[PDB]
Each structure stands twice: as C-alpha cells, then as structure tokens.
Amino acid sequence: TLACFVLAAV
Amino acid sequence: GSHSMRYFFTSVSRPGRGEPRFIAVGYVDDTQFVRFDSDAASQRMEPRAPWIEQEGPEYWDGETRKVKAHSQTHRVDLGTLRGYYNQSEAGSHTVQRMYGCDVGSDWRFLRGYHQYAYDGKDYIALKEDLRSWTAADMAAQTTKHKWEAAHVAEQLRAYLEGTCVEWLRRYLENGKETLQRTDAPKTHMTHHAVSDHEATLRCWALSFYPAEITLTWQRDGEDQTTELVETRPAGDGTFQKWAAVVVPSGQEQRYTCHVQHEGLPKPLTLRWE
C-alpha cells in the first residue's frame, strides 16, 4: 500500500 | 533471504500535449504488482500480478484515492519547481519519487528511503535515520525548510518502519508461490567462431529468479579481463543474463564459466566440451 498521509509539496 | 517493497513515481509535464503525465508502479522484490497511469482508462490503481488480484474493493478504492493524491501533489510540484529554477512553461520536465523499505532474512525492518529527483538529478532525499533531509542544491534548501517545519520526516518514518513493513510481509504470504520462490538458472554454453584467430564463448543463464546473480570467466582457474550484459527480464517473471569472452582458437578448454545464484545448492562450473 502507498503512504496514507498527504505528501507535502516542494 | 532479504526482501523489499518499492514504489516508483514518474511525473512528466508535456507543453502542447495536454496535462501532466503521472505513473506509479509498485514492486515487491523484483516482481511488480501494481500500477497507475493517468493516461489509462480506468483512472484507478490496477493489479499487475495474479496474487494481488484477490485484494478486495476496499483495498483498490483506497489505493486509488492515495495515488490520486500523490498525482495532485506532483502536479503542483511541477509548477513550483519551474519557479525555483526560473523556467518557462514551454520546456518539458520530469519529476521522480521513490520510497519503500527493506527487511532482513528475519523479516524485520532494515532500512527505509524517500528519494526525490528533478530532471534526472538528485533533488531531496530522506537520510537513513528517517529524521533528516539531504538537499542537492539551494533550491531543495527551501523545500528542506518547508518539510522540516511540516514534520514530513516523522510522518514518513512511521510509514516506512511500520505499515510499509507489515504490508511487505502480508504480500509475501499472499504471494507465497510467486514471491517466496527461487528459480535456479538454466545454463548452457555456445561457441561461435567470429574470426579465424578468435572465437567467442558465451555463458548463458535463463529463467532465474530473483534477478541477483554473478557470472565469472576464468582461464586456467584465474579471473578474466569480458562482456557482461545487464540482466534483462524474460517477460514471464524470470530474468536472463550472459557473459562472453573472446578466446584464441584451440585454447577453449582453458576457460571455465562460473555461475552462482541463491537457487543453486552450490555454484556451477561450465566448460566448452
């Protein structure tokens, strides 16, 4: 499974 | 036997060819099991392995939602990166993300990673401690600041040390017959007279899994100077590889090929005869 949380933008 | 799970993400802007492309693929060891292609029709995460097929709608709906979120983040990043480097929205650009984890032979966490790249070059990456970042340049410094302030690290570390590892294990049993297998290389040697003074000996390895392997050439029992081809996929879940040496005619028996693979009880020694 992918990471669950939202990924911070750069 | 060590194991791992990896996700590879590709984000590609294409000015004059529509909206950004987004591709995600997932691997367990050397076997892929999932994919997402923003150009595909389903717009969902898809099974690329028989053993993952038996996952329920709960799983697929969830994975689809995440990969979509991933996609959106990269969509934003593409523009942001343009700004950091002062690039016009006419040039084509690529972003790459890679994360996953490693387990030892005991199936316990060894190591996790989160590597990010822009136009084929390192951008920012998560240090081994899963607590700090390495910025490739000054641009990535600003991102490093952001992510520190947002505590991205601890978020990833939680995933990498836990969920990632737990699911790698789950996949390993669900795909026992596939993933927990070793296919011993089928071997053979071919002699081909190229010139009148020189002939080529090629050592073959086929239908082996996993991909790790080592092929060595020895003359009189001594290592050799040799064409070693990058290990290639057969297309049926196994891998191929050959090693060749250019030997003077008549001196063929002086040469021995040595094959080692974890599917073999012990190394093999092939000679042309």
């Binding site: - | 892929q32 084509s92 136009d119 084929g120 086929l206 081809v229 990058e230 290639r232 996929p233 297309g235």
Partner: protein
C-alpha cells in the same frame, strides 16, 4: 540534466525454436527522459500490436521499458528493434540474434 542514451537488448522470451511460438523482446534502459519510440520490425516493416511494461527507473534515475510481441521464429525471417530517442542523432536499429 544528464541526457542518457538508451541501452538496447533484442531477444526472445524462451530459447528460439523454429515453429514454436515465442515472444520477441526489446529491452530499453538507462535512458532519460522517458519519452521513447520502440518498434519491432519483421523483415523491415514494423509489427502491429506491440505491448510494453509499465514505466520504471533505476537508482540513478534512468528509465527502463520492456517491449514485446508474439512471434513464431523461422529462418529466414529477420527481426530487429527500432529505437528512437532524443539523445540519438538518428533511430538505432539492432538486429535480433537468436545466435547469441
């Protein structure tokens, strides 16, 4: 940007055996960016239905793709892989060699 030129391997899935249907493979790798043209030729004309694996990359960020199509090996039928990429002055053609 480190423009990387694609490596090319043309081969079959199983050992080539005249009569037995097989799979013709073309494995491109170590290239960048990911835009790439890969065709399989039969006696000089390209083959119609050619499938490929999903896009993925190596530790150095270089890409790799497997193209394939069903085919029944015969002499004197000749196959090759045509690969066009940005780092290439002109399309590179590699003849298939069961001989390898």
């Amino acid at each position: 940007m480190i423009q990387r030129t694609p490596k090319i391997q043309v081969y079959s899935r199983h050992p080539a055996e005249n009569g037995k249907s097989n799979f013709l493979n073309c494995y491109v790798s170590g290239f960048h960016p990911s835009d790439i043209e890969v065709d399989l030729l039969k006696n000089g004309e390209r083959i119609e239905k050619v499938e490929h694996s999903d896009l993925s990359f190596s530790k150095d960020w270089s890409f790799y793709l497997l193209y394939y199509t069903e085919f029944t090996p015969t002499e004197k039928d000749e196959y090759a892989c045509r690969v066009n990429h940005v780092t290439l002055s002109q399309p590179k053609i590699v003849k298939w060699d069961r001989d390898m």
